[PDB]
Design a protein around this ligand. Structure first.
Ligand SMILES: Nc1nc2ccccc2c(=O)[nH]1
Length: 168
């Protein structure tokens, strides 16, 4: 049903909220939730671990079956799997891990996958343990994505920094 509420307009197609993406997916019933995935679709922590836990491991069993046919995803790549109870679809996107020397230029490739979907609930890609500056990730999102993206940012202090950087 895509019932987004309380998102702050950044651009005509990019919105942002200080919120837990799991709690957003339950209220909003989005067509697409984006997972910040790794190449093995092993949902061990961060957003991936939170989304998988909210599906009581249904997402991990589906992900394993995909990886059995595909082998690992490419950095910058994605797959569309079931959203289970969270969404119609989950778009698993792999952003570069700059800690492992993956090139930050691949973050544009990662966000380009969003353009296959009219409306997405998403986190910022390559943040947290993938080591990219989240404000940089937001700039790449805004420059790359032309479909309607609703960004959820968990941490209030990071959210305020993102909105300050973008609107001040
Ligand atoms: N519930 C929950 N939400 C998150 C959102 C972003 C990153 C991490 C998390 C997390 O670890 N748990």
């Amino acid at each position: 049903v895509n019932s987004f509420s309380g998102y702050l307009k950044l651009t005509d197609n990019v919105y942002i909220k200080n919120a837990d993406i799991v709690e957003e997916a339950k209220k909003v019933k989005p067509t697409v939730v984006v997972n910040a995935a790794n190449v093995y679709l092993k949902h061990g922590g961060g957003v991936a671990g939170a989304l998988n836990k909210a599906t009581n491991n249904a997402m991990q069993v589906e992900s394993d079956d995909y990886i059995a046919t595909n082998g690992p995803l490419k950095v910058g790549g994605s797959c569309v799997l079931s959203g289970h109870n969270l969404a119609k679809h989950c778009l698993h996107v792999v952003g570069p891990n700059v800690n492992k020397g993956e090139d930050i230029q691949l973050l544009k490739s990662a966000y380009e996958n969003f353009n296959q979907h009219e409306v997405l609930l998403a986190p910022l890609l390559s943040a947290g343990i993938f080591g990219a500056d989240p404000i940089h990730s937001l700039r790449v999102c805004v420059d790359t994505v032309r479909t309607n993206v609703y960004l959820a940012v968990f941490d209030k202090n990071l959210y305020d920094k993102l909105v300050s950087s973008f609107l001040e």
